[PDB]
Design a protein around this ligand. Structure first.
Ligand code: ADP
Lengths: 269, 370, 278
């Protein structure tokens, strides 16, 4: 049970992420008794249903999914449309619509299209809200991608001093299917995941939508840059380590001069 | 060659130059190109008119001063050569290229083209027989004597975190950003553009940079110190013109931490430094935590390193012992190390002779640089 | 109830697609999953052999020290792996790196010495360019052509550093003086996994056509072609880091907005900040 669960999670880390849905299907076919555990750990990738009455292609998650009935973040139409289930507060319903519109604009601010849906479900001292953003790949080019922004905010409003504790769950996926000749059949999928706390003020000028949107902006750019620098420079070092371009015996004399530098360091210190 | 080797402290904002053995660069004057602004009429009006130094600082309002080292990269190549001739002149060197050995320094992530063009100067126009283009961060390590240190320069158009190991950095874990106090001070002037101060000349802006070096700092609390209302301390121009300062003094350096103030595709040089350190082994990161070296000139603000410390505490994990060395000749730390390496006579193999250029050009430098 | 044969196929597939170095660990994980060693080893034995073949496992027989990459041109079918570099066939435990009893191989020679010269120059280069994993040029005089199968491979496995890089470079060539073709691939398998999986895989399908004059004459020439394709492609990838870093990134997810300044949702929600005219 636990041995298969742990080996399954680390195996998903080891398995090719291009088949995550099919890999998980193969995993359920292997051990179906640990199906929901792996579904809870590794959530579903971004699926899109259409809010036909509102004309909104909306992302699919666990929270909108009333059982197995995906709530639209605009019309609250389940998929299949049920009558009772995933329901935020009425004020939270309208606030959710506002947040969805503004974050669709955010998706246009960084993606200039795509599908994004934020789902909310009220609670007393704050609540939890899942933030989702999906974008396709460069169809105009040889590089393909499947943007999978999976985010969950831990809204914890504090009545004292109108602040609100937040801890946005971070999880972003995208493909780097660059099939360029200079890149070869190069593909990469950053199955990223982070989270960090903050207590932000909720006001008329800084409401929940604005607060969380700012944190989203911050977190996304930070993680994205962290990948681009740390991970990609690291892979560059890996590229140089597996295959060096410079022939040796050239670097040897340079290292001998390096030894002489250390010698001089000892000559003075 | 049996002469005192020339050390060239390639400062972005303030370039310097000197020799071996010394601790302060023999001749100091910043990096700029001061072109004229009028036409000679009276016999007594000097000629050449693209003056540097005493005439520049003297007649700031008469010289259209420009800057070649844009983004830490010289654009007025030929003019910089003539600035070296200004150094070669009776003012600073009083010698020739062919006489003294020379040592050029460099920042990380530099394009080869600049190095090649420089070598063209060095061995064609100038004809130094003993010269090689070295780095700058390792020179600050020579100054500190440290081995596993992170060097952070602070110039005008360059900012780089260099995680070094015994004077031999991982040429991959190093990060480099080509922006500092130039546009930051321009942005501070932009703050004053809102309050009516668009005094556009660079020499007129040199005064603003004198304020940058003088009436500016880094408040650790970002919004708690920015959103409040200041006292607007006054400043007086060379004539003594009253100009208030306000919050701008610490608002503008936030650009280095929040590039969104100018819209730069950077992420805060502090985070970039964190990432420069994070591109190595954890224990090597510990060694770099123990040795944090600062260079350049913009390392002279109040709460500069303090706000940096706070940022690292809010970003880096636990137990990160941020041991930041705070020397004073951070500008000259690179020069100090150049004088140190210049004193090292092992440089014979490390240099590039004139015939070495004749047979390799700059390929020899690219084969010997690290 | 689900049939275990599906698990056999899925297991063999995933074990052939296992990360480099973590292959046996992947096999251990799958053994912890199914725990039916018979059905496991059914597709897993071929997964072992096939993984060694495609992944170019550099098995090194101690009595010869060849570091021969495992491919399809080495086995005798009964685990005995021929060596194009030293004319010996040794049995090999596919489940491990365990090899045994290298029996000499009376083979062609009209190509073996030729690839030995090529492999000598390639080994001198590759060892100055690789650290963990090297080259192995297979030979075969099939279809009236002295077919050079220059298989090259590189890796380094640092799970402490959380990465398992892997390089492979199979080159297809036929010594047919003078019309010969330098065909080749430059397979990559980078496996970083800490806090974001980085399973980077690429290659470079290239086909050149060199003229075969002599053994040592065109040996270094063929190696030079491979050499330049390696240097060029690695250079292209180094440039690809920057070009993708900005182009691909901002193309999919922008770094800053179009205005690049700041996103203030307060003023955005206020007045409906631009949906009126824009
Ligand atoms: N006291 C100071 N306070 C703040 N900034 C300073 C001070 N002195 C110098 N600077 C900044 O450092 C710059 C000097 O550039 P420099 O550090 O020589 O370039 P490099 O980093 O290439 O050596 C100046 O442009 C100035 O903006």
């Amino acid at each position: 049970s636990d041995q298969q669960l742990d080996c399954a999670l680390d195996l998903m880390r080891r398995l090719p992420p291009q088949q995550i849905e099919k890999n998980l299907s193969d995993l359920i076919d292997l051990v179906p008794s640990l199906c929901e555990d792996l579904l809870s750990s590794v959530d579903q990738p971004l699926k899109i249903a259409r809010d036909k009455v509102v004309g909104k292609d909306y992302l699919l998650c666990d929270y909108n999914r009333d059982g197995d009935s995906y709530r639209s973040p605009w019309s609250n139409k389940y998929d299949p449309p049920l009558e009772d289930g995933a329901m935020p507060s009425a004020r939270l319903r309208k606030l959710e619509v506002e947040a969805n519109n503004a974050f669709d604009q955010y998706r246009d601010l960084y993606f200039e299209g795509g599908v994004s849906s934020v789902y909310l479900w009220d609670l007393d001292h704050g609540f939890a809200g899942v933030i989702l953003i999906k974008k396709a790949g460069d169809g105009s080019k040889k590089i393909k991608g499947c943007w999978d922004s999976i985010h969950v905010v831990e809204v914890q409003e504090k009545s004292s001093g109108r602040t609100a504790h937040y801890k946005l769950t971070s999880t972003v996926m995208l493909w780097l299917q660059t099939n360029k000749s200079g890149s070869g059949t190069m593909n990469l999928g950053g199955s990223l995941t982070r989270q960090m706390e903050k207590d932000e003020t909720v006001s008329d000028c800084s409401p929940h939508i604005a607060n969380i949107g700012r944190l989203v902006e911050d977190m996304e750019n930070k993680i994205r840059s962290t990948l681009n620098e740390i991970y990609f420079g690291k892979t560059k070092d890996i590229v140089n380590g597996l295959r060096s371009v410079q022939t040796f015996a050239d670097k040897s004399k340079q290292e001998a001069l390096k030894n002489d530098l250390v010698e001089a360091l000892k000559r003075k210190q | 060659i049996a002469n005192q080797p020339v050390v060239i402290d390639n400062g972005s904002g303030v370039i310097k130059a000197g020799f071996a053995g010394d601790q302060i660069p023999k001749y100091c004057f910043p990096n700029y190109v001061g072109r004229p602004k009028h036409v000679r009429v009276m016999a007594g009006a000097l000629e050449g008119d693209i003056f540097i130094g005493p005439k520049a600082e003297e007649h700031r309002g008469l010289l259209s001063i420009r800057y070649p080292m844009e983004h830490g990269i010289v654009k007025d190549w030929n003019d910089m050569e003539r600035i070296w001739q200004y150094v070669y002149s009776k003012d600073q060197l009083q010698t020739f290229s062919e006489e003294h050995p020379v040592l050029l320094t460099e920042a990380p992530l530099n394009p080869r083209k600049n190095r090649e063009r420089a070598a063209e100067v060095f061995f064609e126009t100038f004809n130094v027989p003993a010269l090689f283009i070295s780095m700058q961060a390792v020179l600050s390590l020579y100054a500190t004597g440290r081995t596993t240190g992170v060097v952070l320069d602070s110039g005008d158009g360059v900012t780089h975190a260099v995680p070094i190991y015994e004077g031999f950095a991982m040429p991959h874990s190093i990060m480099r950003i080509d922006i500092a106090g130039r546009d930051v001070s321009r942005f501070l002037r932009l703050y004053l553009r809102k309050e009516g101060y668009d005094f556009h000349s660079s020499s007129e802006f040199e005064i603003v940079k004198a304020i940058k070096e003088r009436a500016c700092y880094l408040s650790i609390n970002p919004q708690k110190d920015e959103t409040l209302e200041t006292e607007k301390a006054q400043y007086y121009l060379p004539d003594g013109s009253t100009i208030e300062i306000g919050p701008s003094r610490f608002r503008a350096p936030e650009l280095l931490f929040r590039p969104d103030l100018i819209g730069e595709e950077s992420e805060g040089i502090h985070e970039v430094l964190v990432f420069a350190i994070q591109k190595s082994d954890m224990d090597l990161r510990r060694t770099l935590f123990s040795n944090i070296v600062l260079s350049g000139g913009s390392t002279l603000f109040k709460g500069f390193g303090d706000r940096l410390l706070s940022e690292v505490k809010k970003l880096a994990p636990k137990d990160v012992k941020i041991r930041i060395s705070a020397p004073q000749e951070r500008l000259y730390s690179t020069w100090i190390g150049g004088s140190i390496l210049a004193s090292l006579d092992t440089f014979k193999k490390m240099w590039v002779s004139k015939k070495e250029y004749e047979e390799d050009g700059a390929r020899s430098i690219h084969r010997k640089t690290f | 109830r689900v049939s275990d044969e599906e698990k056999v196929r899925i297991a063999a597939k995933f074990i052939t697609h296992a990360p480099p170095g973590e292959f046996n660990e992947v096999f251990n994980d799958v053994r912890l999953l199914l725990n039916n060693d018979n059905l496991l080893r059914e597709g897993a034995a071929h997964a072992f052999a096939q993984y060694n073949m495609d992944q170019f496992t550099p098995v090194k027989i101690e009595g010869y020290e060849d570091q021969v990459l495992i491919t399809e041109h080495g086995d005798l079918g009964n685990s005995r792996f021929l060596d194009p570099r030293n004319k010996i066939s040794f049995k090999f435990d596919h489940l491990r790196k365990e090899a045994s009893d290298p029996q000499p191989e009376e083979v062609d020679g009209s190509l073996k010495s030729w690839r030995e010269s090529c492999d000598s120059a390639l080994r001198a280069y590759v060892k100055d360019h690789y650290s963990n994993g090297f080259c192995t040029v297979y030979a075969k005089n099939i279809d009236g052509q002295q077919t050079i199968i220059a298989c090259i491979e590189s890796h380094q496995f640092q799970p402490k550093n959380f990465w398992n890089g892997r390089w492979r470079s199979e080159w297809k060539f036929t010594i047919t003086p003078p019309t010969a073709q330098v065909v080749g691939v430059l397979k990559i398998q980078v496996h970083y996994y800490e806090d974001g999986n980085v399973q980077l895989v690429s290659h470079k399908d290239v086909q050149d056509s060199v003229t075969v004059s002599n053994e040592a004459q065109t040996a270094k020439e063929f190696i030079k072609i491979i050499e330049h394709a390696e240097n060029e492609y690695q250079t292209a990838i180094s440039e690809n880091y920057q070009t993708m870093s900005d182009t691909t990134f901002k193309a999919l997810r922008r770094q800053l907005p179009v205005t690049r300044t700041k996103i203030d949702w307060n003023k955005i929600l206020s007045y409906k900040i631009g949906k009126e005219m824009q």
